[PDB]
Design a protein around this ligand. Sequence first.
Ligand SMILES: Nc1ncnc2c1ncn2[C@@H]1O[C@H](COP(=O)(O)OP(=O)(O)OP(=O)(O)OP(=O)(O)OC[C@H]2O[C@@H](n3cnc4c(N)ncnc43)[C@H](O)[C@@H]2O)[C@@H](O)[C@H]1O
Length: 195
Amino acid sequence: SMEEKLKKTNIIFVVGGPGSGKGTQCEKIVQKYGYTHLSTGDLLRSEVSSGSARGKKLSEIMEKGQLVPLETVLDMLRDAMVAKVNTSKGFLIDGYPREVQQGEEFERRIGQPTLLLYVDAGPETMTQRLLKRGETSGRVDDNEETIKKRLETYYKATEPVIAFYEKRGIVRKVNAEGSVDSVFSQVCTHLDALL
Ligand SMILES: Nc1ncnc2c1ncn2[C@@H]1O[C@H](COP(=O)(O)OP(=O)(O)OP(=O)(O)OP(=O)(O)OC[C@H]2O[C@@H](n3cnc4c(N)ncnc43)[C@H](O)[C@@H]2O)[C@@H](O)[C@H]1O
């Protein structure tokens, strides 16, 4: 089973706000440590690209800055894991869990996290990076009004996730401000402590 195989492979939740640099940092973790980077947003956007009726409904939700329903995103993530479970040296789950129920369901049905890497940026920094990214086409959810809704959703639903895992004792926090290299230096100090 999935649950059985995953007991021998580390799972790291990587959680931060929109434009926190979480994805950027996950790609550097892959380069250095050779974990599997799975992004729920990337999975959802591929389904938009497919032009399915579901992709249509997903673009509407993402373009409003809201959370896709839990079962839809958890099933896609699960499939992505099954596809790599026999070769993976470890999983970086980027952008899930984004609400407390998402963590509960994942742990009940898939597996338990070793670590939550909290990429902690301020909202002014987040807004700057997303407005900058929005100067090129490709992410229509970088619309300035959608940036605001994404930040609101993050503080309402996603910050409570950090506090939950903090109590459990698995949170390692990095200051997400500064250069990519300076943020990654912190990430490495924490990962090198365990890995
Ligand atoms: N679990 C879930 N449940 C329900 N719905 C879900 C879900 N997961 C996703 N969704 C849906 O999908 C949507 C999109 O989510 P995501 O795919 O996670 O997109 P995001 O919040 O923009 O983060 P992303 O990883 O792309 O960007 P990053 O912070 O790396 O920042 C990248 C930008 O910052 C720049 N940057 C990075 N580090 C920098 C640094 N140190 N200095 C300057 N710029 C930096 C980069 O160059 C780049 O421009 C959600 O809003 C939601 O609707």
